[PDB]
Amino acid sequence: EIVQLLMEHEQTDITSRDSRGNNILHALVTVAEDFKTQNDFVKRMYDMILLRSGNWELETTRNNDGLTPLQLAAKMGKAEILKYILSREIKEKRLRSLSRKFTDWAYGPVSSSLYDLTNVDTTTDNSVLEITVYNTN
Amino acid sequence: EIVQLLMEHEQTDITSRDSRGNNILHALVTVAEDFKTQNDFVKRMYDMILLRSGNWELETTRNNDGLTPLQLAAKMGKAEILKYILSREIKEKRLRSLSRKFTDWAYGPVSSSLYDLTNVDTTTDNSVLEITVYNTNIDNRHEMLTLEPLHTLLHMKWKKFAKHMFFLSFCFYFFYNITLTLVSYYRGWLQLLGRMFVLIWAMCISVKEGIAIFLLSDAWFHFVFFIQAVLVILSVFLYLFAYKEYLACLVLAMALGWANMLYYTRGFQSMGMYSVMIQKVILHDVLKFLFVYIVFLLGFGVALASLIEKCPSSYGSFSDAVLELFKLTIGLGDLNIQQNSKYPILFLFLLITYVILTFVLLLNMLIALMGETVENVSKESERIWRLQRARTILEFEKMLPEWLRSRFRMGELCKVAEDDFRLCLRINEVKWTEWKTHVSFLNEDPG
Amino acid sequence: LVLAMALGWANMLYYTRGFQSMGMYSVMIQKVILHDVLKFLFVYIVFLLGFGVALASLIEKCPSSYGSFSDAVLELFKLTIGLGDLNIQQNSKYPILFLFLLITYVILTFVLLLNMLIALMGETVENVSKES
């Protein structure tokens, strides 16, 4: 409720980066320890804030370590939130652009989804598939 | 309800001690067998009576055995009630002084509680940490040392002083045993440097072991360290004495020392449970196999000594025949076609029956083992290791000088209530499950 | 050259990791040789080097079956396999202690082999498979 109140005001800067460089989404990635520990409330807030502000900027921005929050979720050992980020199906047609999983072929029980490999398929500097494999910590 | 009625009357004496010396709380400690047996109603009554009479007297008083009900809960094997007594958070500000766990630093999901180490931190005559460790009659100490303050006290004492003392003692023993081997393998100017230290350290171990052996599967090793030093000092006496029987006790002391160095593998994190496995299995599973194997040895020995003595020979007297059978179970004794024997077919049949019975007996020790390993063995190993470490930590805790223990002095004096002024232990924790606006807190600025 | 050979035939185990079924097998080799066996090996070496100086102290009375230290350690390692023929104590000061000390070596080696098997049985059920 308080998060909705703070998003309602025009004075609020959603995209504000802190001293460490993290916007709000990087922080939510920082905190999301585990399902049994937290009960996955962070995933809900990650959904709600993006659906509140329809943009790619928040995922676009980087902390001082130079990482998008997808790449931060991969660098840290955050799995339950990555399963959400890496496959999003937004139903609303106005904010449907922000989805990363698209169904294009559904006829019935058979359907083929369509994932986004933008920062994932090792075609960039450090993709998710590179980080999650080459990270020993 | 009736307990409330009886507390309502002014004629009631809450603090009345019975013939045995127990007030009401000692009694409730006496009865509290287990959770599944009782459903933990005793804990509720322990709470209700203290909240009815706000005092420290009831916990202060002692039975004729001279024990506070905390110490009584520790002496008896009462765990579920001790987890309650040892960490109480009373919310009421008027009776908040009677709590033993205080939260002083809560900001959000992160918070550090603050336990009371008054009668717990081995700074008194017999603390809880002393009783629960040195009491053998409990048979439930696995669940006693995992409680909130005690577990961390053991970790802290290990991190501060017991690790270094243990490693240092291991080092001295290692140097000692190597000097013993360097003396015995080459058997004078180097002996003047070595043997003096050897005799001094042998006398030291023997004195310590004879001192602590009079006050007592936990004491076995400590019984062996004495026998080793006895053998060493005996061999050093018989070195100056003119005899040949000194080397025997010397090398037996050697082999016993290299067998005793298994003791110090118990302090390691990973290798400790391994040595505990050695101990438990050699104590229980193998000793059943060994006697029932010896009886077959001594039966078939007289059997074969009865047959093959017909023409005085491969299998000679009894001792040689038993030795040949023991050569056989390994594969060393070459099977000889029966010669100088009355009846060779019975000879061979009786021997093959020995082979088969030994094989199925080895098989069954393996079987009982497989059955043992799955659940009980692992839990038993972990429990024994934790208990052993706890025993060692408190053994070294009493070796230190008087000023050294006061120098370490785990805990800090916190300001609680108007003037609690009690030694406390700080433990930081993180709780994401329950969200509660923090009403009861001691310090406002979280440091 | 020959050490490089043997090391190459030991390194070809690396490429068994790409196979579907044989891969988890080599991972089992690695995990067990790393964790379960290495505990057994040092605690076996220490008995070797204790009983070696012991037997070299006894059987050196008349310079001989068990000679210098290296030969005695070698004979003990012959014994744990079954290769070293057990000799009745000769050229020895005291044969009964000789035989007793050797049988104690046999029994301690046996129970130690037993315990590595035990910790192994405990390891295999759930954690080992998932780890592999």
Side-chain angles (χ1 to χ4, degrees), chain A residues 2-7 9 12-32 35 37-38 41-46 49-51 53-56 58-59 61-64 66-74 76-79 81-82 84-88 90 96 98-115 117-120 122-123 126-129 131-135, chain B residues 2-7 9 12-32 35 37-38 41-46 49-51 53-56 58-59 61-64 66-74 76-79 81-82 84-88 90 96 98-115 117-120 122-123 126-129 131-135 138 141 144-147 149-158 160-181 183-186 188 191 194 197-198 201-202 204-206 210 212 219-222 224-226 228-232 234-236 238-242 245-246 248 250-267 270 272 274-276 278-279 281-282 286 289-307 312 315-316 318-319 321-323 325-333 335-337 343-371 373 378 381 384-385 387 389-390 392 394 396 399-401 403 405-406 408 411 413 416-417 421-427 430 432 435 438-442 446-447, chain C residues 1-18 21 23 25-27 29-30 32-33 37 40-58 63 66-67 69-70 72-74 76-84 86-88 94-122 124 129 132:
Chain A
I2 295 166
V3 173
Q4 292 179 358
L5 294 174
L6 292 172
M7 290 186 292
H9 295 283
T12 303
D13 189 359
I14 303 298
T15 62
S16 178
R17 295 174 69 252
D18 62 355
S19 66
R20 185 175 291 170
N22 289 321
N23 64 8
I24 188 163
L25 299 178
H26 292 286
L28 294 174
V29 175
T30 53
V31 170
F35 180 77
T37 300
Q38 289 186 358
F41 66 91
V42 177
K43 188 184 290 190
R44 294 178 180 177
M45 299 302 295
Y46 183 84
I49 296 165
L50 292 172
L51 297 173
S53 66
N55 288 317
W56 294 98
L58 296 172
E59 292 179 352
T61 57
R62 293 181 179 177
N63 59 4
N64 294 118
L67 295 174
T68 61
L70 182 64
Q71 293 179 356
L72 181 61
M76 294 177 72
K78 268 61 188 299
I81 191 69
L82 184 63
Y84 181 78
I85 299 167
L86 187 62
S87 66
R88 293 180 292 171
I90 296 168
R96 185 178 179 179
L98 296 174
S99 64
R100 293 177 66 89
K101 181 174 75 67
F102 294 99
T103 61
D104 59 355
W105 185 66
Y107 182 75
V110 178
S111 66
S112 65
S113 66
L114 187 64
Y115 292 91
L117 297 177
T118 60
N119 291 318
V120 178
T122 63
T123 61
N126 52 357
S127 66
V128 175
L129 184 61
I131 296 164
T132 60
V133 177
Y134 293 106
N135 188 0
Chain B
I2 295 166
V3 173
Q4 292 179 358
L5 294 174
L6 292 172
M7 290 186 292
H9 295 283
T12 303
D13 189 359
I14 303 298
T15 62
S16 178
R17 295 174 69 252
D18 62 355
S19 66
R20 185 175 291 170
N22 289 321
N23 64 8
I24 188 163
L25 299 178
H26 292 286
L28 295 174
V29 175
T30 53
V31 169
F35 180 77
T37 300
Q38 289 186 358
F41 66 91
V42 177
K43 188 184 290 190
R44 294 178 180 177
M45 300 302 295
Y46 183 84
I49 296 165
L50 292 172
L51 297 173
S53 66
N55 288 316
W56 294 99
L58 296 172
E59 292 179 352
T61 57
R62 293 181 179 177
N63 59 4
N64 294 118
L67 295 174
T68 61
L70 182 64
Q71 293 179 356
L72 181 61
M76 294 177 72
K78 268 61 188 299
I81 191 69
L82 184 63
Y84 181 78
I85 299 167
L86 187 62
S87 66
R88 293 180 292 171
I90 296 168
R96 185 178 179 179
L98 296 174
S99 64
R100 293 177 66 89
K101 181 174 75 67
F102 294 99
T103 61
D104 59 355
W105 185 66
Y107 182 75
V110 178
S111 66
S112 65
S113 66
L114 187 64
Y115 292 91
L117 297 177
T118 60
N119 291 318
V120 178
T122 63
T123 61
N126 52 357
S127 66
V128 175
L129 184 61
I131 296 164
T132 60
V133 177
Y134 293 106
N135 188 0
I138 298 168
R141 293 177 287 173
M144 298 297 289
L145 297 171
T146 60
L147 296 172
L150 296 171
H151 184 73
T152 59
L153 289 175
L154 296 172
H155 291 289
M156 292 297 283
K157 291 180 181 181
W158 183 257
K160 296 293 182 291
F161 63 91
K163 185 185 283 183
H164 295 285
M165 294 177 74
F166 181 78
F167 180 76
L168 181 64
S169 178
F170 178 68
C171 293
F172 284 115
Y173 182 77
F174 184 71
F175 293 111
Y176 175 77
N177 192 358
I178 295 165
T179 54
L180 184 62
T181 58
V183 170
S184 174
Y185 179 75
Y186 293 98
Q191 293 181 356
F197 182 77
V198 172
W201 185 258
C204 294
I205 296 170
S206 66
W220 182 68
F221 294 102
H222 185 73
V224 175
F225 291 104
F226 183 73
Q228 184 178 0
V230 173
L231 294 174
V232 175
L234 190 150
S235 66
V236 173
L238 295 177
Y239 183 74
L240 294 175
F241 181 76
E245 293 179 353
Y246 65 91
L250 183 64
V251 299
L252 184 62
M254 177 189 290
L256 188 64
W258 293 103
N260 287 323
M261 187 176 286
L262 183 64
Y263 179 75
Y264 294 98
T265 61
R266 185 173 56 76
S270 296
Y274 183 75
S275 65
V276 174
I278 299 173
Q279 181 57 247
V281 177
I282 186 167
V286 177
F289 178 80
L290 293 174
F291 182 76
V292 66
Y293 182 75
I294 293 161
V295 66
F296 291 111
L297 289 176
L298 297 172
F300 292 98
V302 294
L304 298 176
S306 64
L307 281 78
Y315 296 167
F318 178 73
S319 179
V322 176
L323 183 62
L325 294 170
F326 183 76
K327 291 181 187 291
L328 182 64
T329 186
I330 296 166
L332 297 169
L335 181 61
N336 189 0
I337 296 166
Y343 294 161
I345 297 168
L346 181 64
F347 182 80
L348 183 63
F349 179 76
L350 189 147
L351 185 63
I352 295 164
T353 53
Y354 178 74
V355 175
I356 296 166
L357 293 174
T358 302
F359 181 76
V360 66
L361 188 64
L362 180 62
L363 189 65
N364 192 16
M365 67 176 288
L366 185 65
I367 290 165
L369 185 63
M370 293 304 104
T373 53
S378 66
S381 66
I384 294 164
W385 180 65
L387 177 63
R389 283 291 299 277
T392 59
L394 296 172
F396 292 106
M399 294 298 290
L400 295 172
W403 63 269
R405 297 174 68 188
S406 66
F408 292 103
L413 293 173
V416 174
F421 293 114
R422 67 185 71 188
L423 294 170
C424 297
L425 182 63
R426 187 180 294 275
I427 295 170
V430 179
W432 292 99
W435 293 99
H438 295 285
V439 177
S440 66
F441 62 93
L442 184 63
Chain C
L1 183 64
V2 299
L3 184 61
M5 177 189 290
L7 188 64
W9 293 103
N11 287 323
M12 187 176 286
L13 183 64
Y14 180 75
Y15 294 98
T16 61
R17 185 173 56 76
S21 296
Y25 183 75
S26 65
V27 174
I29 299 173
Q30 181 57 247
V32 177
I33 186 167
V37 177
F40 178 80
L41 293 174
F42 182 76
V43 66
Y44 182 75
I45 293 161
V46 66
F47 291 111
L48 289 176
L49 297 172
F51 292 98
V53 294
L55 298 176
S57 64
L58 281 78
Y66 296 167
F69 178 73
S70 179
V73 176
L74 183 62
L76 294 170
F77 183 76
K78 291 181 187 291
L79 183 65
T80 186
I81 296 166
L83 297 169
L86 181 61
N87 189 1
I88 296 166
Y94 294 161
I96 297 168
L97 181 64
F98 182 80
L99 183 63
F100 179 76
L101 189 147
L102 185 63
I103 295 164
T104 53
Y105 178 74
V106 175
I107 296 166
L108 293 174
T109 302
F110 181 76
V111 66
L112 188 64
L113 180 62
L114 189 65
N115 192 16
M116 67 176 288
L117 185 65
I118 290 165
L120 185 63
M121 293 304 104
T124 53
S129 66
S132 66

PDB file of all heavy atoms in Angstrom, chain A residues 62-77, unseen atoms left out:
ATOM      1  N   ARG A  62      22.286   0.460 -15.040  1.00  0.00           N
ATOM      2  CA  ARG A  62      23.362  -0.340 -14.478  1.00  0.00           C
ATOM      3  C   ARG A  62      23.904   0.314 -13.218  1.00  0.00           C
ATOM      4  O   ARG A  62      23.981   1.543 -13.128  1.00  0.00           O
ATOM      5  CB  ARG A  62      24.493  -0.512 -15.484  1.00  0.00           C
ATOM      6  CG  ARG A  62      24.109  -1.340 -16.682  1.00  0.00           C
ATOM      7  CD  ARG A  62      25.262  -1.500 -17.648  1.00  0.00           C
ATOM      8  NE  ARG A  62      24.884  -2.323 -18.793  1.00  0.00           N
ATOM      9  CZ  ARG A  62      25.672  -2.597 -19.830  1.00  0.00           C
ATOM     10  NH1 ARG A  62      26.909  -2.118 -19.900  1.00  0.00           N
ATOM     11  NH2 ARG A  62      25.213  -3.361 -20.809  1.00  0.00           N
ATOM     12  N   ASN A  63      24.277  -0.517 -12.251  1.00  0.00           N
ATOM     13  CA  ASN A  63      24.962  -0.039 -11.063  1.00  0.00           C
ATOM     14  C   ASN A  63      26.410   0.306 -11.405  1.00  0.00           C
ATOM     15  O   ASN A  63      26.858   0.176 -12.547  1.00  0.00           O
ATOM     16  CB  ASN A  63      24.873  -1.080  -9.948  1.00  0.00           C
ATOM     17  CG  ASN A  63      25.483  -2.416 -10.330  1.00  0.00           C
ATOM     18  OD1 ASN A  63      26.053  -2.576 -11.408  1.00  0.00           O
ATOM     19  ND2 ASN A  63      25.362  -3.387  -9.435  1.00  0.00           N
ATOM     20  N   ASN A  64      27.160   0.752 -10.395  1.00  0.00           N
ATOM     21  CA  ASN A  64      28.561   1.089 -10.619  1.00  0.00           C
ATOM     22  C   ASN A  64      29.392  -0.128 -11.000  1.00  0.00           C
ATOM     23  O   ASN A  64      30.466   0.032 -11.589  1.00  0.00           O
ATOM     24  CB  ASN A  64      29.153   1.753  -9.379  1.00  0.00           C
ATOM     25  CG  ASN A  64      28.540   3.107  -9.095  1.00  0.00           C
ATOM     26  OD1 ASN A  64      27.924   3.317  -8.056  1.00  0.00           O
ATOM     27  ND2 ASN A  64      28.702   4.033 -10.028  1.00  0.00           N
ATOM     28  N   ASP A  65      28.925  -1.333 -10.684  1.00  0.00           N
ATOM     29  CA  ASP A  65      29.553  -2.550 -11.178  1.00  0.00           C
ATOM     30  C   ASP A  65      29.228  -2.826 -12.641  1.00  0.00           C
ATOM     31  O   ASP A  65      29.753  -3.795 -13.199  1.00  0.00           O
ATOM     32  CB  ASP A  65      29.128  -3.745 -10.323  1.00  0.00           C
ATOM     33  N   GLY A  66      28.377  -2.017 -13.269  1.00  0.00           N
ATOM     34  CA  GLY A  66      28.093  -2.165 -14.682  1.00  0.00           C
ATOM     35  C   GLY A  66      27.300  -3.412 -14.997  1.00  0.00           C
ATOM     36  O   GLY A  66      27.712  -4.218 -15.836  1.00  0.00           O
ATOM     37  N   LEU A  67      26.161  -3.580 -14.330  1.00  0.00           N
ATOM     38  CA  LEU A  67      25.330  -4.764 -14.490  1.00  0.00           C
ATOM     39  C   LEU A  67      23.866  -4.367 -14.529  1.00  0.00           C
ATOM     40  O   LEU A  67      23.409  -3.595 -13.685  1.00  0.00           O
ATOM     41  CB  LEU A  67      25.556  -5.754 -13.347  1.00  0.00           C
ATOM     42  CG  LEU A  67      26.933  -6.400 -13.237  1.00  0.00           C
ATOM     43  CD1 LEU A  67      26.993  -7.216 -11.972  1.00  0.00           C
ATOM     44  CD2 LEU A  67      27.240  -7.270 -14.436  1.00  0.00           C
ATOM     45  N   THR A  68      23.144  -4.898 -15.509  1.00  0.00           N
ATOM     46  CA  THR A  68      21.700  -4.802 -15.522  1.00  0.00           C
ATOM     47  C   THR A  68      21.136  -5.726 -14.447  1.00  0.00           C
ATOM     48  O   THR A  68      21.805  -6.673 -14.026  1.00  0.00           O
ATOM     49  CB  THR A  68      21.163  -5.180 -16.901  1.00  0.00           C
ATOM     50  OG1 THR A  68      21.529  -6.529 -17.207  1.00  0.00           O
ATOM     51  CG2 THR A  68      21.723  -4.258 -17.969  1.00  0.00           C
ATOM     52  N   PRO A  69      19.914  -5.473 -13.967  1.00  0.00           N
ATOM     53  CA  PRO A  69      19.414  -6.271 -12.840  1.00  0.00           C
ATOM     54  C   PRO A  69      19.193  -7.723 -13.192  1.00  0.00           C
ATOM     55  O   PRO A  69      19.194  -8.571 -12.294  1.00  0.00           O
ATOM     56  CB  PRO A  69      18.107  -5.572 -12.465  1.00  0.00           C
ATOM     57  CG  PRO A  69      17.676  -4.919 -13.679  1.00  0.00           C
ATOM     58  CD  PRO A  69      18.901  -4.502 -14.416  1.00  0.00           C
ATOM     59  N   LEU A  70      19.007  -8.032 -14.473  1.00  0.00           N
ATOM     60  CA  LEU A  70      19.086  -9.413 -14.924  1.00  0.00           C
ATOM     61  C   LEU A  70      20.484  -9.968 -14.691  1.00  0.00           C
ATOM     62  O   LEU A  70      20.657 -11.037 -14.091  1.00  0.00           O
ATOM     63  CB  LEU A  70      18.713  -9.477 -16.403  1.00  0.00           C
ATOM     64  CG  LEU A  70      18.688 -10.837 -17.091  1.00  0.00           C
ATOM     65  CD1 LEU A  70      17.634 -11.717 -16.490  1.00  0.00           C
ATOM     66  CD2 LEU A  70      18.433 -10.653 -18.564  1.00  0.00           C
ATOM     67  N   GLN A  71      21.500  -9.233 -15.142  1.00  0.00           N
ATOM     68  CA  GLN A  71      22.875  -9.662 -14.939  1.00  0.00           C
ATOM     69  C   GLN A  71      23.241  -9.673 -13.463  1.00  0.00           C
ATOM     70  O   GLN A  71      24.064 -10.487 -13.044  1.00  0.00           O
ATOM     71  CB  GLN A  71      23.830  -8.757 -15.708  1.00  0.00           C
ATOM     72  CG  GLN A  71      23.716  -8.860 -17.208  1.00  0.00           C
ATOM     73  CD  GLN A  71      24.667  -7.930 -17.922  1.00  0.00           C
ATOM     74  OE1 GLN A  71      25.373  -7.144 -17.292  1.00  0.00           O
ATOM     75  NE2 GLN A  71      24.693  -8.013 -19.246  1.00  0.00           N
ATOM     76  N   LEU A  72      22.633  -8.802 -12.660  1.00  0.00           N
ATOM     77  CA  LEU A  72      22.896  -8.826 -11.226  1.00  0.00           C
ATOM     78  C   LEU A  72      22.270 -10.051 -10.581  1.00  0.00           C
ATOM     79  O   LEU A  72      22.886 -10.697  -9.723  1.00  0.00           O
ATOM     80  CB  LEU A  72      22.362  -7.551 -10.580  1.00  0.00           C
ATOM     81  CG  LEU A  72      22.564  -7.358  -9.079  1.00  0.00           C
ATOM     82  CD1 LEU A  72      24.022  -7.321  -8.724  1.00  0.00           C
ATOM     83  CD2 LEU A  72      21.897  -6.080  -8.642  1.00  0.00           C
ATOM     84  N   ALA A  73      21.044 -10.383 -10.986  1.00  0.00           N
ATOM     85  CA  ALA A  73      20.402 -11.600 -10.514  1.00  0.00           C
ATOM     86  C   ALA A  73      21.203 -12.830 -10.894  1.00  0.00           C
ATOM     87  O   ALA A  73      21.208 -13.821 -10.156  1.00  0.00           O
ATOM     88  CB  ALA A  73      18.995 -11.695 -11.089  1.00  0.00           C
ATOM     89  N   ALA A  74      21.879 -12.791 -12.041  1.00  0.00           N
ATOM     90  CA  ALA A  74      22.727 -13.908 -12.437  1.00  0.00           C
ATOM     91  C   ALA A  74      24.036 -13.925 -11.659  1.00  0.00           C
ATOM     92  O   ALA A  74      24.506 -14.994 -11.256  1.00  0.00           O
ATOM     93  CB  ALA A  74      23.003 -13.844 -13.933  1.00  0.00           C
ATOM     94  N   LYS A  75      24.638 -12.752 -11.444  1.00  0.00           N
ATOM     95  CA  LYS A  75      25.904 -12.675 -10.725  1.00  0.00           C
ATOM     96  C   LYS A  75      25.743 -13.175  -9.300  1.00  0.00           C
ATOM     97  O   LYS A  75      26.462 -14.077  -8.860  1.00  0.00           O
ATOM     98  CB  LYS A  75      26.426 -11.238 -10.736  1.00  0.00           C
ATOM     99  N   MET A  76      24.799 -12.600  -8.564  1.00  0.00           N
ATOM    100  CA  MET A  76      24.414 -13.192  -7.299  1.00  0.00           C
ATOM    101  C   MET A  76      23.668 -14.495  -7.562  1.00  0.00           C
ATOM    102  O   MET A  76      23.255 -14.791  -8.686  1.00  0.00           O
ATOM    103  CB  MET A  76      23.557 -12.225  -6.489  1.00  0.00           C
ATOM    104  CG  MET A  76      24.293 -10.982  -6.028  1.00  0.00           C
ATOM    105  SD  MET A  76      23.239  -9.818  -5.154  1.00  0.00           S
ATOM    106  CE  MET A  76      22.988 -10.702  -3.620  1.00  0.00           C
ATOM    107  N   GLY A  77      23.493 -15.279  -6.507  1.00  0.00           N
ATOM    108  CA  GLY A  77      22.910 -16.600  -6.640  1.00  0.00           C
ATOM    109  C   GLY A  77      21.399 -16.632  -6.587  1.00  0.00           C
ATOM    110  O   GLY A  77      20.808 -17.566  -6.039  1.00  0.00           O
TER     111      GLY A  77
END
